Design a protein around this ligand. Structure first.
Ligand SMILES: N=C(N)NCCC[C@@H](CS)C(=O)O
Ligand SMILES: [Zn+2]
Length: 305
């Protein structure tokens, strides 16, 4: 149960960490719970930044999908960076002074626990479905964004089950509720996944392009260029539908249609050699190169308020 930033931490460890990282950095981090999972675990959200009046924000979550462990790991890496370098690195000091970073460590907690206890390749939530023994809904097929129209299944037994309705899951409802209650401050939405090495932007539920697809393409292009500067990691980018595959009900598409103009989905390492079982030995390298990308986007948004 001892936390490590170069190891994958189980939920009890991550929860302890949310509490300890908050208590040690009261001037930079505040922790709240935005809801509970189907199984009663607390959905924590850390608010990172120097508190001030009416601050704009960037919202980032990890752990939508249970088996994408490098995702969870990144949210934690991000937080330590914020606090070790505030006051020393000009950009991060500038980011933290100017905006508030909403970091949601793990969205799908019940599923994360399941990958640690029974099935390592579990992806969905762990809720029950009526009329079947099959368990779970794909949280990224559960948002109101052309809900269940494409790239989603209506069968609970499938890995891409879209749910009984949009926001049927307490976790997606909770996340959606928080974003809706904070539209005014939230300027960018970032949702961390794995794997494939890509940076996607709207839309995935459709082949139609967002109004600012030109900017998002340039932004994404610059961010991947940035990421590649550390270890040469090659990422592709573009609108989801055409870049990865069409898939309805994703949070990135939903957030974008809420008014949040900078909405990106990051698909971290690797390209399929280890897939979801990305070794711990790649945690720092992955997190380090990903920081550059997130920071690039952060500077851009700040400079485009
Ligand atoms: N498809 C959307 N809406 N956004 C990009 C996410 C693709 C993928 C992540 S594991 C998935 O959720 O299947
Ligand atoms: Zn995913």
């Amino acid at each position: 149960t001892g936390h490590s930033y170069e190891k994958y931490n189980n939920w009890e460890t991550i929860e302890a960490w949310t509490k300890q990282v908050t208590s040690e950095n009261p001037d930079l981090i505040s922790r709240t719970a935005i809801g509970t999972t189907f199984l009663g675990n607390n959905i924590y959200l850390l608010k990172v930044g120097k508190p001030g009046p009416n601050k704009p924000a960037i919202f980032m979550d990890c752990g939508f999908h249970a088996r994408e462990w490098i995702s969870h790991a990144f949210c934690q890496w991000f937080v330590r960076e914020a606090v070790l370098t505030y006051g020393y690195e000009s950009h991060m000091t500038e980011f933290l002074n100017k905006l508030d970073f909403y970091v949601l460590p793990v969205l799908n907690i019940d599923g994360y626990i399941y990958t640690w206890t029974k099935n390592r390749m579990w992806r969905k939530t762990r809720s029950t479905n009526a009329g079947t023994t099959c368990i779970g809904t794909d949280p990224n097929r559960n948002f109101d964004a052309g809900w269940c129209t494409t790239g989603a299944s209506t069968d609970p037994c499938d890995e891409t089950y879209c749910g009984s309705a949009a926001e049927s899951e307490k976790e997606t409802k909770a996340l959606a509720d928080f974003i809706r209650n904070n539209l005014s401050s939230i300027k960018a939405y970032l949702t961390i996944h794995s794997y494939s090495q890509m940076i996607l932007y709207p839309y995935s539920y459709d082949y139609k392009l967002p109004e600012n697809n030109a900017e998002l393409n340039n932004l994404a292009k610059a961010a991947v260029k940035e990421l590649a500067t550390l270890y040469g990691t090659k990422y592709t980018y573009g609108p989801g539908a055409t870049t990865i595959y069409p898939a309805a009900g994703g949070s990135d598409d939903w957030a974008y249609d809420q008014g949040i103009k900078y909405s990106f989905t990051f698909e971290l390492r690797d390209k399929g050699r280890y897939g979801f079982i990305l070794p711990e030995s790649q945690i720092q390298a992955t997190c380090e190169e990903t920081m550059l990308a997130i920071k690039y986007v952060t500077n851009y948004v700040l400079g485009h308020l």
